[PDB]
């Protein structure tokens, strides 16, 4: 007989090379087994494609989220010190004017 992985690997030409002692009905049965196994591989590789898409998208979304969170937080902190420095610069505005 034959095994599963061996059927999927070969082509239709090599499949025609293994018609030893089988009826016409066993021919289509074996051909339908290959198409079924080929279909299982198609669906599986289709799943792996979408899982890879989702994981890679999620890993690179989880990055950008932390990137903008760190950026938003640091800009908030910097704009505080930046506003405070300008406040004291503006305090020296009025004092510089008060002298003559």
């Amino acid at each position: 007989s034959l095994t599963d992985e061996e059927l999927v690997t070969m082509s239709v030409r090599e499949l025609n090379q293994h018609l030893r002692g089988l009826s016409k009905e066993e021919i289509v049965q074996l051909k339908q087994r290959r198409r079924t196994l080929k279909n299982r591989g198609y669906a599986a590789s289709c799943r792996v494609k979408r899982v890879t898409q989702k994981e890679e998208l999620e890993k690179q979304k989880a990055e950008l989220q932390q990137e903008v969170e760190k950026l938003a937080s640091e800009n908030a902190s910097m704009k505080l010190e930046l506003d405070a420095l300008r406040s004291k610069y503006e305090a020296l505005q009025t004092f510089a004017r008060t002298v003559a």
Binding site: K61, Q65, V68, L71
Partner: protein, 105 residues
């Protein structure tokens, strides 16, 4: 006539298939009550109900899967825009600080 309707008919299931599937549990039980079904009839009813419900969860599951990738791809877009808006703000903050630090050495 679907294969499900033929089988139910062949087993003398008096209920329409749609009512076997879509009816709520309390109403399904009410309809099922006062009925002398045998095991074969009970099994085919429950098999039609389960397959019918699960068929819709499968579509919903696949619909949500694709919809989720669209939302992730949008999520990506907005974050790349927010990063650029944030870097622009950081620049105008870095420039104002530098200009004030320059005027004071």
């Amino acid at each position: 006539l679907t294969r499900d309707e033929l089988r139910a008919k062949a087993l003398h299931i008096p209920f329409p298939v749609e009512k076997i599937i879509n009816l709520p549990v309390v109403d399904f039980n009410e309809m099922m009550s006062k009925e002398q079904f045998n095991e074969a009839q009970l099994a085919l009813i429950r098999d039609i109900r389960r397959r019918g419900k699960n068929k819709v969860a499968a579509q919903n599951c696949r619909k949500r899967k694709l919809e989720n990738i669209v939302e992730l791809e949008q999520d990506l877009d907005h974050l790349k825009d927010e990063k650029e808006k944030l870097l622009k703000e950081k620049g105008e903050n870095d420039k104002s600080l530098h200009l004030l630090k320059k005027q004071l050495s």
